[PDB]
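Structure (tokenized):
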């Protein structure tokens, strides 16, 4: 069990544009195209990400390339954020996966705004963080995509994915 298998399970796989639990336009393994309300703007974003006229549909290899790019962006996003990085570096191995997963889903900006959760995580207050994350818009809006992540922050094990 690793970050890639963990996100695969949480985000699954869709080969045609859809609206995720936040209501935004998306394809592959949780690849967000745009926050614009316009399907056609998302449609361009897709051809642009892939390098061909798609059309709203992609292959498995292409989804996995996108997936790898998106994991990579999520880790880079953490390390370049002055708020996330020191909290990330205090975390043990398994919790770091939960942290990458949380950013992959929520984006850097969303995660970094949960100021107190970040402090609870840094002080290793696992129970409180998980309670305060279980209140978030993310959890209520995206409960099945979030549940295993939140449980993982509490326990620091992989049991939620087994
Ligand atoms: Ca690391
Ligand atoms: Cl969900």
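Design, position by position:
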């Amino acid at each position: 069990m690793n970050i890639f298998e963990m996100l695969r399970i949480d985000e699954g796989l869709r080969l045609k544009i859809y609206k995720d639990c936040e209501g935004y336009y998306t394809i592959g393994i949780g690849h967000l195209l745009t926050k614009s309300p316009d399907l056609n703007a998302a449609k361009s974003e897709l051809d642009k990400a892939i390098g061909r006229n798609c059309n709203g549909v992609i292959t498995k290899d292409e989804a996995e390339k996108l997936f790898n790019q998106d994991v990579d962006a999520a880790v880079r996003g953490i390390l370049r954020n002055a708020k996330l990085k020191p909290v990330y570096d205090s975390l043990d191995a398994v919790r770091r996966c939960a942290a990458i997963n949380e950013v992959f889903q929520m984006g850097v900006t969303g995660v970094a705004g949960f100021t107190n959760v970040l402090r609870m995580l840094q002080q290793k207050r696992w129970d409180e963080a998980a309670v305060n994350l279980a209140k978030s818009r993310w959890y209520n809006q995206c409960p099945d995509r979030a549940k295993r992540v939140i449980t993982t922050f509490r326990t620091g094990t992989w049991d939620a994915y087994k």
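Reviewer-requested clarification: DSSP finds ten helices and three strands in the chain. The radius of gyration is 16 Å.
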